CSV table of C-alpha atoms and ligand atoms in Angstrom, one decimal:
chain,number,residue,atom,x,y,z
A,1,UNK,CA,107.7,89.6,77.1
A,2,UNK,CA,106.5,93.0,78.3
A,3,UNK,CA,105.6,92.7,82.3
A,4,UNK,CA,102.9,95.1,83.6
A,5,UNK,CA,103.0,95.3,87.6
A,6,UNK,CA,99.8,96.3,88.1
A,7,UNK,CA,98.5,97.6,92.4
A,8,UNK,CA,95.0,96.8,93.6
A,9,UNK,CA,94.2,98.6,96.6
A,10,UNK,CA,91.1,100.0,98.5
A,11,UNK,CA,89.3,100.0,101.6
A,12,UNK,CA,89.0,96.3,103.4
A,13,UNK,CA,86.4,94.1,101.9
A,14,UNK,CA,85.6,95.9,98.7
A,15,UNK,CA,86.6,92.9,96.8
A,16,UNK,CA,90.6,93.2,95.8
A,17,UNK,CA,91.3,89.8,96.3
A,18,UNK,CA,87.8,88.2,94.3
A,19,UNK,CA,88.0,90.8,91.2
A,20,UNK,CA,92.4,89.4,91.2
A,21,UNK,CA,91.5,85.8,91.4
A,22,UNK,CA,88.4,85.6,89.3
A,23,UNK,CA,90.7,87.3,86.6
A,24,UNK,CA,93.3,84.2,87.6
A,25,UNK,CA,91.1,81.5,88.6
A,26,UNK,CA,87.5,82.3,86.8
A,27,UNK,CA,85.9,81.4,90.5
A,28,UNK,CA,84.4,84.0,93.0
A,29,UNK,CA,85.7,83.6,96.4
A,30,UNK,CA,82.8,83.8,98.6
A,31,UNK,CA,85.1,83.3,101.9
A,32,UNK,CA,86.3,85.8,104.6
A,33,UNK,CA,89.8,85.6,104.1
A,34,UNK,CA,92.3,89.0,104.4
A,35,UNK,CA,95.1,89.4,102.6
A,36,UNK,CA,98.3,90.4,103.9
A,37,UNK,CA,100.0,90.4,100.6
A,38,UNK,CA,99.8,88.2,97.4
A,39,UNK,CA,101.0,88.4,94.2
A,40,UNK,CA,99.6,86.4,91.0
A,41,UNK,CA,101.6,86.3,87.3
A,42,UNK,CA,99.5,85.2,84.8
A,43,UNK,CA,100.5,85.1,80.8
A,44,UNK,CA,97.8,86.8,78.7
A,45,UNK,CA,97.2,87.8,75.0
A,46,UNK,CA,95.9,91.6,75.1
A,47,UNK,CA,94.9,92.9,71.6
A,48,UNK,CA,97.8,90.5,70.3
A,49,UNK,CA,100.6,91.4,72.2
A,50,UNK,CA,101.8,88.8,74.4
A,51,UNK,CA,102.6,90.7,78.4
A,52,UNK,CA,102.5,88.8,82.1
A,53,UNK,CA,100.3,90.4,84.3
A,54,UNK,CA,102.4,90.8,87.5
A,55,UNK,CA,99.3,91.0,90.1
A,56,UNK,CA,99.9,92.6,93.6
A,57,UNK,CA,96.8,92.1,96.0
A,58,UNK,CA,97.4,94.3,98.7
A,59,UNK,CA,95.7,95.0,102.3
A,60,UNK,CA,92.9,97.0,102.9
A,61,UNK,CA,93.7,97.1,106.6
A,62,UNK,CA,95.6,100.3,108.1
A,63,UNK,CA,98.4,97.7,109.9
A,64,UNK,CA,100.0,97.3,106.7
A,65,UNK,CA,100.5,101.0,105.4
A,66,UNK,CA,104.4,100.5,105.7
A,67,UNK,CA,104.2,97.3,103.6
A,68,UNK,CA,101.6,98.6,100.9
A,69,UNK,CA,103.8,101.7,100.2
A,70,UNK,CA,106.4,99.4,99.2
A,71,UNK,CA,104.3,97.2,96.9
A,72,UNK,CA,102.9,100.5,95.6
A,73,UNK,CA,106.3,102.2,95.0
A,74,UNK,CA,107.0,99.2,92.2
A,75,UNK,CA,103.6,99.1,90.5
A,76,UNK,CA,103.1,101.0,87.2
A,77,UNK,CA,99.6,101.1,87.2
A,78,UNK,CA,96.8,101.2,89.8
A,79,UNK,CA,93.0,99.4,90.4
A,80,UNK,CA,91.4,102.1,92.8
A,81,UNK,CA,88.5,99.5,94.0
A,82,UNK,CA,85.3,100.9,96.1
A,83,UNK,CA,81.9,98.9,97.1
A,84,UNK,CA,79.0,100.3,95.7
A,85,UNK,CA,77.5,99.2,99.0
A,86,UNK,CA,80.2,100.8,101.1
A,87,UNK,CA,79.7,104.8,101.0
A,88,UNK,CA,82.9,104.5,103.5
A,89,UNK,CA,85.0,102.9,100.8
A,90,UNK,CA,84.2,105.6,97.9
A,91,UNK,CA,85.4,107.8,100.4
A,92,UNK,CA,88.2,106.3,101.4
A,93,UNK,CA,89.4,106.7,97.4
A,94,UNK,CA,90.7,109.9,97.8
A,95,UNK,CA,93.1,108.7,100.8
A,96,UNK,CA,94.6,105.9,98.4
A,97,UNK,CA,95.0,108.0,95.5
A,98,UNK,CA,97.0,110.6,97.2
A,99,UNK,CA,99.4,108.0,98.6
A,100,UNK,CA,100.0,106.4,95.4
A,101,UNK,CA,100.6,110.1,93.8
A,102,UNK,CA,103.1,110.6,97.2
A,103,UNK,CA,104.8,107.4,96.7
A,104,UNK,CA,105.1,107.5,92.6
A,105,UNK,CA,106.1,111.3,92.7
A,106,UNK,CA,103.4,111.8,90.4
A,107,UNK,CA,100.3,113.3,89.6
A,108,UNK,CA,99.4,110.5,86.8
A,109,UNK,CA,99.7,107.2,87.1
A,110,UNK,CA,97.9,104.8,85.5
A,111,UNK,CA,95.0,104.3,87.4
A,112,UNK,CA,91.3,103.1,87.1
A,113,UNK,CA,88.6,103.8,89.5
A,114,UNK,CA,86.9,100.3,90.3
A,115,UNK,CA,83.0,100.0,92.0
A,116,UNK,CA,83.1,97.0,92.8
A,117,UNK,CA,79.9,94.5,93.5
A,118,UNK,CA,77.8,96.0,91.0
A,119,UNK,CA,75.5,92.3,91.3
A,120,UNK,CA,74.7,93.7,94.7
A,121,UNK,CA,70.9,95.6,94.5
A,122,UNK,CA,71.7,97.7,98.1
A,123,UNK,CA,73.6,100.6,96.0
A,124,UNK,CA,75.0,103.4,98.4
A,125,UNK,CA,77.0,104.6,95.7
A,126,UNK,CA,75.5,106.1,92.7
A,127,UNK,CA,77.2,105.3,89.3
A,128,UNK,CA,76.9,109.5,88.7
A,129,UNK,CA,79.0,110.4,91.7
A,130,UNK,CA,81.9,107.9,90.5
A,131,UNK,CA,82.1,108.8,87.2
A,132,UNK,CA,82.1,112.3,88.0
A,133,UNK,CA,85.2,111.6,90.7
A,134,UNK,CA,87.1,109.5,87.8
A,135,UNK,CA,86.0,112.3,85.5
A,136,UNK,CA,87.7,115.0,88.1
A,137,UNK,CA,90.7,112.5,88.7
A,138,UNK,CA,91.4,112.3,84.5
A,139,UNK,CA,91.0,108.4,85.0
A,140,UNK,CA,88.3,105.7,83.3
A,141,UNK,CA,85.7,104.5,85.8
A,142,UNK,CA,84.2,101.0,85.6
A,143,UNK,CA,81.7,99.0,87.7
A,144,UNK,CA,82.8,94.9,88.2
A,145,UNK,CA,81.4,92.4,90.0
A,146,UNK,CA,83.4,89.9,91.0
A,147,UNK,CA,80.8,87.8,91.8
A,148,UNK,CA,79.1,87.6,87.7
A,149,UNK,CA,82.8,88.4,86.6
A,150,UNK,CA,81.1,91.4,84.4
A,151,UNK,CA,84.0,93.8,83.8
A,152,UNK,CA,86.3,92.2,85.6
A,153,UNK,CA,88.7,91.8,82.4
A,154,UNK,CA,87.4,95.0,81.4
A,155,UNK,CA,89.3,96.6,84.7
A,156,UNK,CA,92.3,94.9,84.1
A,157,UNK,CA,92.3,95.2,80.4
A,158,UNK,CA,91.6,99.4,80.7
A,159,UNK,CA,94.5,99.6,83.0
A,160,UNK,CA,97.1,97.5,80.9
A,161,UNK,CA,95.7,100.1,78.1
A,162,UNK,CA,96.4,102.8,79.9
A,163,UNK,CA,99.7,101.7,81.0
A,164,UNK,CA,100.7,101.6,77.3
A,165,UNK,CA,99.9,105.2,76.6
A,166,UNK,CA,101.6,106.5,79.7
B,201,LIG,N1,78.3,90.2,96.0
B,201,LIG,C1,79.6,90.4,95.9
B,201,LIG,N2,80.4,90.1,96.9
B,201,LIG,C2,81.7,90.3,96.6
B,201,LIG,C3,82.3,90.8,95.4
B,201,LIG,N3,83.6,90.9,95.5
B,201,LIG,C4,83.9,90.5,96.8
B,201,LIG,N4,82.8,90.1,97.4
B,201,LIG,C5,82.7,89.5,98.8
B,201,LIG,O1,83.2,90.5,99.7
B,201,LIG,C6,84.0,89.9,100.7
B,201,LIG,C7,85.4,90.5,100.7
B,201,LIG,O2,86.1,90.1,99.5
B,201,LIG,P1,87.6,90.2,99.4
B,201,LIG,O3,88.0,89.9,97.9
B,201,LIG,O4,88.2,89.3,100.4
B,201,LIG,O5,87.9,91.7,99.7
B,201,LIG,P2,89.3,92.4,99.9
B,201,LIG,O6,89.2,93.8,99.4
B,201,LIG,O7,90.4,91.6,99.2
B,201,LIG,N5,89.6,92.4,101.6
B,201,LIG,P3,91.1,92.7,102.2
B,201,LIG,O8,91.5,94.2,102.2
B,201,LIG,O9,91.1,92.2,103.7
B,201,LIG,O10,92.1,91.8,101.5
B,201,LIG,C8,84.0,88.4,100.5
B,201,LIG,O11,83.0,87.8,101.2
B,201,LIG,C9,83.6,88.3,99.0
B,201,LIG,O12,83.0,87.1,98.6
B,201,LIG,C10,81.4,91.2,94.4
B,201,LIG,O13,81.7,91.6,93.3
B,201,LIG,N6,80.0,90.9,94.7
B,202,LIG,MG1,92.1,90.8,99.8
């Protein structure tokens, strides 16, 4: 079957590794726990075709730079996640987009820009200003919590979409 290695990066703490294993394990992980570097495979049906989701949970920490390049250099599609609480992390976007463009010799990739925690009522991030940086990027925006699991499929869905019209 087709194999889609999808990347989630963004700032530490936005919510890489909750919005990844809710879509695996339909439970929100309400624990402090950093990743280093996991990977997930999981066998799903999107609009009929049978694919495996090859899932790389990266760090948001700076020590692992070297070892997030690699892991980006092999995905063919990108989650750009941000807090809507976190006006630090929205910035940070740009910073992680240009490194995938520098490490995937592209100006395109398959990408979506994520807001994560949309459950959260303490919004530093207003949808507008998002949309209109996905808009400026050429890439589809969508808010998730991982917490209510609203658009979580719809992220990883959107990207396996976009993958197939790359
Ligand atoms: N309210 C709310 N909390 C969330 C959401 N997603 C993650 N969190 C919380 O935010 C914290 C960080 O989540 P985590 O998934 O570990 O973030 P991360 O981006 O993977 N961090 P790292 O870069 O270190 O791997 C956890 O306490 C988690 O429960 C969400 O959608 N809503
Ligand atoms: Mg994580």
């Amino acid at each position: 079957m087709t194999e889609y290695k999808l990347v989630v990066v963004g700032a530490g703490g936005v919510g890489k590794s909750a919005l990844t294993i809710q879509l695996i394990q339909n439970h929100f992980v309400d624990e402090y726990d950093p990743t280093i570097e996991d990977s997930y495979r999981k066998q799903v049906v999107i609009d009929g075709e049978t694919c495996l989701l090859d899932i790389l949970d990266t760090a948001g920490q700076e020590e692992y730079s070297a070892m997030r390049d690699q892991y980006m250099r092999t995905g063919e599609g990108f989650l750009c996640v941000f807090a809507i609480n976190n006006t630090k992390s929205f910035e940070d976007i740009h910073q992680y987009r240009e490194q995938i463009k520098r490490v995937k010799d592209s100006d395109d990739v398959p990408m979506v820009l994520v807001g994560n925690k949309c459950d959260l009522a303490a919004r530093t991030v207003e949808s507008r200003q998002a949309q209109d940086l996905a808009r400026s990027y050429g890439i589809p925006y969508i808010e998730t919590s991982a917490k209510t699991r609203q658009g979580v499929e719809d992220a990883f869905y959107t990207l396996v979409r976009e993958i197939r019209q790359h």
